[PDB]
Amino acid sequence: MLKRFPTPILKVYWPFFVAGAAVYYGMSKAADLSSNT
Amino acid sequence: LQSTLDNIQSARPFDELTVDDLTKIKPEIDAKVEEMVKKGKWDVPGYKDRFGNLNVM
Amino acid sequence: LTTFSLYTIIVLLVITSLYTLTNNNNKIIGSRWLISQEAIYDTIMNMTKGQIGGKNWGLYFPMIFTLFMFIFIANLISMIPYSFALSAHLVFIISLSIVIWLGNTILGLYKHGWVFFSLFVPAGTPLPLVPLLVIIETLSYFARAISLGLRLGSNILAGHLLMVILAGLTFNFMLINLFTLVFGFVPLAMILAIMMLEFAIGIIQGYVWAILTASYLKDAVYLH
Amino acid sequence: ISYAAYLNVAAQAIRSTELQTASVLNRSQTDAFYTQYKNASEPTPITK
Amino acid sequence: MQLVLAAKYIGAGISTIGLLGAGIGIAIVFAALINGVSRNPSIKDTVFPMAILGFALSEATGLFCLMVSFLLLFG
Amino acid sequence: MQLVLAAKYIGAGISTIGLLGAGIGIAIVFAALINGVSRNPSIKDTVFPMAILGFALSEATGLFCLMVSFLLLFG
Amino acid sequence: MQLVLAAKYIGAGISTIGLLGAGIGIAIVFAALINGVSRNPSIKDTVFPMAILGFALSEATGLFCLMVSFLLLFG
Amino acid sequence: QLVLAAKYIGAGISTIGLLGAGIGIAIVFAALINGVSRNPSIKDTVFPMAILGFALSEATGLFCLMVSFLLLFG
Amino acid sequence: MQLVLAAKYIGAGISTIGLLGAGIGIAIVFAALINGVSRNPSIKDTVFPMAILGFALSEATGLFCLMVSFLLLFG
Amino acid sequence: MQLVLAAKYIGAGISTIGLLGAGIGIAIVFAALINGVSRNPSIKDTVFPMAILGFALSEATGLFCLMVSFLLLFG
Amino acid sequence: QLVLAAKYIGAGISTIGLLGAGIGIAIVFAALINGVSRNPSIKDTVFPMAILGFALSEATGLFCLMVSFLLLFG
């Protein structure tokens, strides 16, 4: 079951991960903006 | 050769059998698995000619 | 706290059980429950081998599998009549779609420089409109950004609310005059048909997500 | 390939249970030659 | 005030028009099935999923429309 | 209220428009049935349940418009 | 009331629209019939029960349209 | 008052746009079934294209639908 | 005034109509693609980029419509 | 006044409806193109100049509708 | 200003008349491509026929457009 076979998911999915991070930060500011509504 | 028959007879699976027991007698299993995920494959040839590609499309 | 927070936990606990408890002694024969996840594995194996088909079809097969599985499971959980907040929590779904589109855009810019925009050159055409067809190819590339997310959100949310309005109507159908009490079952059958259909189209939508966001990656990796 | 050559190959294919008479077998396998000629000299009787 | 409530119910009526399209779409998919079957009847087992798929997917836009109709109508 | 009630009676007519799509739809399925059957002769035994299924689904989309009409008037 | 009386006459007019679709539908079944019978003229006797069914179902959506008009007009 | 009425009206009109996507979807799937009946075997290439065709046809209608909710509230 | 503000929102709603044509448009291109390819098999290598061009233009009609809708809606 | 500025916003919305005819139109030219090319394998050299001409005027009709939208809205 | 208002609304309405002609123009040229691909050689005769239908279908829309300008003026 849990017996890892290494996967390169840290440079293959580096452009994917970057996109996730940007929206996460923006949603912090958005949450503060949405809590004033 | 008589002994050879005995060895498969005491080790004939048919319902289940840990892939770990097969791994313990052959680490070749894990070698291929690791190599294939690295390869960007998950299709290993001959798995589709006797266990299909399990799809209708 | 929020229903969404609770239901994200429920999805995780289900997924662990499908690859442990379901399997009997790592069957080399396949357990009866586990047979579903064999067929899924192979038809998404052959799908991302189809769409991108690189030496990275399998490198992006886990990504396409967790994009399959999140939406596939999250359109089963929300179907419970007092559950309603995974893909009906739209703010996660639309956001996820835009993130994937951006992760294709960044990959394309990185991999193909500032001539990523040669993807948005479709091919040769009459010279006074050559820059124009770069603009309205890039627009169509970023139509993919919101189409993918908003399809899923609208479908699932609309199904649950449609059923509830009809359920409430059948309550009042069985509270008006005695001629409607007879045939108070007739609207119930309509709600039942919708419960089947809305369940079906969510499993289709999880697969539809995972083929469409393989197609966008085909565009991004292979220019023009 | 002629339409009838395509069909011929199909007729040939039909003897490939097998329950095929001598006439069937002859229609599905025979040895012959087509002796091309010229406008003059004959390019050989190369298999039909 | 009455104008607001009138407009709410009017808006409901307007939305309902969208359904007509989906009804035709479903029919076209079944017409295609019948013609396909008549042209090759052994196609049927592969084709039967495709027929149902086309019906559902066509229908969905109309049901989305109906949900907007119900948002206006009931809401 | 007279306005809102007037909106209902007008609105009933608006929803009623949707029925046109279903009418064309039923015909499209049946037209296909006739064409396919003329090609094969004998295909009809298999195909006739499919034709009924196709009719019911197309018709249903029409009926949703009718149900909105009755929802505005009565409901 | 001017609004209500107006609403009946307007709402009646709008209701009438649905029937056009059914008209087109009837023609479609007949078109298929003629082509079908040309393709096999012995198909007519089997097909004629089916044809009347397809006609009736196509017509019904139009009929319902005319009914909502009549409910306001002649209720 | 009139503005409140207006936002409800604008929402109604926008909902109609979805209709076009539904017809579009049916035409693609009809062509899939027809294609597969013509070839007996086109489906492997054609099926990806058919799902793509659903998505794009749907996408235009879906734009209408988000406009409808923006209208309905706004 | 109220009427001008109303007209912004309503004008946006009316604007949204053009998108329906693009939905049908894209489908017609893809249908022809499927039909041509199913008939030929091997036409596809020429026909697929040709089809994508047809798609891009049909889609564009929808996008122009959406732009105007946003200008009316927000503006 | 209020009515005229309103009428500009409303009128802009109406103008956008016109584009749909070009959207479907463009698809029809491309449908015929793909069909012809799949029949021939190779008609495209003669046919492609013809196709661009037919496309252009069909498209243009949509564009006329679009420019009228801009004229009313922007002034 | 009501007369002027009606003029601006009317301008919007006129675009609708054009849509049918837009489809029509494409249909004649679609026919051109269909015919030419079917025959090959018909094209030299057939191309005048195609142009005629194309133009005529457009012309119906042109009448609607002329009325748009006429409306705009009054």
Added chain:
Amino acid sequence: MPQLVPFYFMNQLTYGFLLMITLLILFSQFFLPMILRLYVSRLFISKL
């Protein structure tokens, strides 16, 4: 519904993106190559 309209959107989205990344690593390293283990084991047995 109150549970479907907080302003806790970033809180929600935090738990959401955590679930995706977790499943991505988990699938990729553990459970997907373990399905290829079933396949390969069956296939190596298939050879012998």
Added chain:
Amino acid sequence: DESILLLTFLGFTGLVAKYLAPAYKDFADARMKKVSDVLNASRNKHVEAVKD
């Protein structure tokens, strides 16, 4: 309102257990057999080689 929906859901799970669950049982069975037969056949196959 929603108690009507819960009755519908109960009907839904009933229909599934009638039609889909035996079909999925059968689906599972069919596949299970195929895997087993291949696996054991191959074990047999090398046993033949031993005898040879």
Added chain:
Amino acid sequence: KLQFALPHETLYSEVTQVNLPAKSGRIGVLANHVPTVEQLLPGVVEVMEGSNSKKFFISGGFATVQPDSQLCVTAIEAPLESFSENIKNLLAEAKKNVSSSREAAEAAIQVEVLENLQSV
């Protein structure tokens, strides 16, 4: 009535039901039918005169309803039973070989006949 003549042995010279696989897909003919000319593909055929049916495996040929209502069928061979399991196995092998060793058309035919054969 119904011609179904073969060169090595002519079979027959319309009958109530004929079921044919043609380059029009599959067609069934009952009574009058429009006076087609269709290439018969390699086929699994049923010919019925009354309810009684004689079943033919046909090497493809031509089918032609005449405007004098004669369904002229010509084939190089036309029983179904005569063609066929062992034949299916051999044809499968032959189908593979022909692909490697006009070759396109031949291999296509081997596959086509193999599929039609499986139907028997």
